Symmetry: D4
Subunit: 205 residues, 8 copies
């Protein structure tokens, strides 16, 4: 089931999130200063999701921004480097603390080169999601039923994926390395917005 | 004496000269830690003098130096600490912390140039001239040549002054918090290199 | 329905074009000084098309060239950079003014890398066209029925595609950037014919 | 006085010296406008003298200079205006027009060479010698060095004469209309760069 | 139908070739000094082919070599640059004169990038051949029926392909350019054997 | 049929190997100092296999290590360069002597670019194996039935593949070159562990 | 007189000096024939003197020179004739034949080096020193500078001697027949370049 | 006499000077053995003198030299023997064994540098200066120039001393067994090059 919102999540539906917050975003493209934030989706892990539609030029969302900046509740992304930069560009908020399931996948799933959400979900959870609506118009006047289902499917399994990946990082001894990556991720995202988006700051160049 | 020479470990007396930040560099047999052994460790307190410590083959202990490296009350200054931190962890098992990297700081504030080596940084920021001719030499040699000893000392003699200059630039241009976060992740970046992620950015897609 | 012509469109069938002119060409290849113009197709947007067969060495087509140079009627291409250069190389005419639906696609469809006509037509218009006859012999002595249908299908939907893309450029605020691109397109095509065809003149090299 | 120094904006008296085309260049902290702030704006009327205007950090207004930049009755001469036009639009919100780019003109008529930088263009077309040693310096410095001031002025002192030489070449070789169309699209090319199309030709397939 | 021979074609079956000779070879690989010639197939254009099995170290084939060096009978290859070098390396014979249908394809079929035999045969002749046996062991003790059928299919249509391509080169005005290419082809092949196999001798380097 | 072992092969099941030993390994990835050895599989060529599960941090396996270092029994790998390095990294043993069927494939199957085990097995032996379980979690608490079947299938045909490839190396005269490659292979693997893993030591750089 | 200057075409008297092979080079406005016009044609009979012929813009006729170019009884010597043959065919419609290319000959017999330019070939084979500084100049200039005239003449003054030296090398190393076949295909190679195959080898798969 | 010249083969008297290892290099017409013929073979016993043997065109026999090359009781020292071993096998059919390659040894122990050429190795290990100017010359020349003869001799005069220096480094850094295995495979590596595997590592996946 999906709860649809315009502009911001209701304070009522924000209270359902008493722990970690699974979160994803939908934009018009991969360049934040060019392609505006259109949708942000949330899920508390109970099999339901909140889908919030963002309007052009909208620069505030009090209930959502409070959840994002809340240091007592962890935020779960799959490749948070992009979403953290977009949310900071749109609302000026620094999402923290974070768990990135793609960084976790790269650190423990060393036997494969597939670290996208789709391949992670079927190997670790035996869950099949579709990638058909990823390249659609997320700024449409009316989000299609398939678009709303795709957006929710991006957050409905992030809690369970994090738990399975965390057990792998424990088994293979890289949980501290992953924790250090999550602490730097907000800085990595802010460095992307400033023009270092295609260079590793820790390299020689 | 401008250069204090030590065999195996720094003396406790000279280790007491370091009441604050410690400038540090290393010399190895190459750029692969699991292949090329650590040969020299050079330190400087910033007063124009340096300690040069010769590391023997197969040596896995240096308690006086290792204590300074792990001491969270004294900051360690490197130029491209990503490599040296990895060599020190591979050799002694010590995680150097906390660190300041003048190369990361240079890439974050000297945005008008692509020259981020130590020689170029010392030339612009401090008008100091150093030569890099002895970097490709046998650092495991029987006896280190005098030219080798001066190159090793000159690699740490100006790191204090360079850090001060670059810190003022990061504060002026508003990226001191970005650099501090980079320094906190640097020991993890080095440990990921030792594990085989040395040629990939862990924060990228692939 | 398709109206076939040899050498030039009839003055009768040119009068059906009281507004924008959808236009495409078919050649023997992508190098204009090597591969001759074989077919030029037109459509006024009513669901019908004129298909004009061009003979080797033919250097004039009065009714068509008058339409191309007419500044009161807009010409619609999908990737006009190629067709404008070919028409200028064959007839010495500078087609103006132009609307390029591929430039428009690149400027507003920022969520995808597919900017060809086929993917544009199905997303924006839900229209499916075949690309089977694109790599055929367009200098054949008799154009096949499939060739004539492929040629017409390249212009039958350019009016409706332009309208949908224009609404997107309006919604996303890049209609002035697209208009500036269309004004430079004839110069970009002429620069290609002179040997700058593989370099961006606005770059350092 | 060969160099007129200004703080923040050009004086109204010196702005009156520009009755025709305005040669113009900028100095920044780097090549990324959203990261590297605008530091200096240099102008020259073509009489051998230059105005050098220091731009403060966070400054978003310069009415006397901005009026000259937007004035459609006076042409602005750049060398690679694609970058400067973007920096000026990002800093002041002004769309510089109309413009002449001696680099675009050089690439369109000097077809016998791949050297299209300003130094090479001034050497062949005018036999003028300029040095580029100070381009990689701190242009946000506390006080601009005299070598910095002369480099900044020399970047605009010859743009009038270079434009005249290249215009005669474009007329002779029959591509003045191609260059004029390139100049008309240049402000859009710069704005597309600021939006993230900076490393792609919008007129290509991909 | 296929006529099988060991070592050399019979003088009887060589007399069936009163005109152009379609010819192809099969080897153990693409490096002539490493991978030996295993099979050479011939066809006179009547729908039948001679398939000659070559033994290891065999350095003579009088009836075949006489056909190859015969200047009165044209030899047809598809990409003769390879086969001419192999035949010269094995028997010391310089095949001349030649018609290469791949060079002809590259010169007149300017609307496509597919210049292999398979795509040439279906577009120009509406003939479908299989490429399944191309990467098999041609030095096997017994050539399989599929291997013999694949080898013959490489020469059964070279006459008809040459005729259709020659008409295209005539129509598009590059028949003299193709003739000049065929005259240089034996030198191009000999230059390959000497180590210039990966550089264009007419370039700067 | 498959014989499962934990930690080491039983001395009873080691006595079944009176000749060459087919052997493969399964790891958590391709970097030995990062990805631990999980499984090593053996087969004597009778159609049955021993599958030994290796525990994390386990640094000894007496019965297996004795087989690996036994100079009187040849060890057969497909691409032994990787497995020899992993076994030397885990147990400190130098496997010798070895026959690598991938080196043999590259030296005699000169007509193809496919030198993996799957393509080698179907061409030379007409045997079809699946590659589905290659990218699985080999450090799982319980190896799946499909994982155990995949692991055994990697060694069940190495004897027969070696024999067929050895006959090809004899026929084409490169058996001495292959023998020289096998003698250097343990050094090539040890050079990989020391950081020369992406450079050919015999090149200029 | 070491350099004979001509406007438009070589005089009939000076054309009579060429009883055998003709060394020839051209100067253009660039490397794209359909964009960059032919400016100068230089010839030399091998006696230490050269004819330098200035080609006007839009000129499509030069009967005295064109006759020498098409004359199958006199061989034309180029260094990288692939380009010049294309420029001459595009400008005058003449197919230069027969030709000898000292660059193709150099690549076929000087197998011990990668330096196949004219300057390197003249240095090793003849110990002649020529400079290439004037190759990137305005050859359509109002008046050709004296340095331009000497560079143009020096490009043809030694082609006879270089051809003789390289021919003896091709005969010695057994590749004179390979070079002769390359020379016979060269006019077709140039015409394929003018048609858009300029960046592909027609004898390759793609 | 510092250089002993021979035509076709080394004399039996001078071949008797080699009681131990034989330093050896070759000069060819290029880097492709099947195209570029062997021209010179240079040997040195390590006493400061060298034998320089001119190889005629089409020559396929040199019994005195070939016996030294195949002699398993005397080691042959090359710098990058991979090429010379291939040229010798292609020319005479001899498999040179056993061999020591100072380049392979340099890449295995001089891990602090990327400069593994002979000139750089002689400069660091022995402080000997040699020039490489004559490597790109006509070694099939009518008469070898004196500069050619000295370059050829200097390529073998120091291989004994260089091998001794590098052997001590391999023993010190623990990779003498790796180098010995590389030397044993080297003749096979060269023969694979002659068969068309010259641009691929046979030990890689592809
Ligand atoms: Mn998503
Ligand atoms: Mn996402
Ligand atoms: Mn360092
Ligand atoms: Mn250092
Ligand atoms: Mn079309
Ligand atoms: Mn089109
Ligand atoms: Mn500028
Ligand atoms: Mn400037
Ligand atoms: Mn075939
Ligand atoms: Mn073939
Ligand atoms: Mn396996
Ligand atoms: Mn394996
Ligand atoms: Mn030339
Ligand atoms: Mn020239
Ligand atoms: Mn050598
Ligand atoms: Mn040499």
């Amino acid at each position: 089931t999906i709860r649809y919102h315009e502009g911001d999540i209701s304070a009522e539906d924000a209270a359902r999130y008493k722990g970690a917050i699974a979160i994803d975003t939908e934009t018009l493209g991969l360049v934040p200063r060019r392609d505006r934030l259109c949708v942000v989706q949330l899920s508390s892990g109970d099999g339901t999701a909140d889908v919030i539609r963002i309007a052009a030029g909208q620069k505030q969302a009090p209930n959502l921004v409070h959840m994002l900046a809340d240091p007592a509740r962890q935020k779960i992304f799959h490749y948070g480097r992009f979403d953290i930069a977009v949310l900071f560009h749109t609302f000026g908020v620094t999402t923290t603390p974070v768990f990135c399931t793609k960084i976790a996948s790269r650190l423990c799933r060393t036997y494969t080169d597939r670290h996208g959400l789709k391949d992670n979900l079927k190997e670790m959870l035996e869950v099949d999601i579709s990638k058909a609506q990823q390249s659609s118009d997320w700024a449409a006047e009316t989000l299609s039923p398939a678009q709303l289902e795709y957006a929710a499917s991006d957050v409905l399994y992030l809690h369970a994926l994090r738990d399975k990946l965390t057990a792998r990082l424990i088994r293979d001894g890289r949980i501290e390395h992953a924790d250090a990556c999550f602490a730097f991720l907000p800085t990595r995202a802010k460095l992307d917005l400033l023009g270092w988006d295609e260079t590793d700051i820790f390299a020689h160049s």
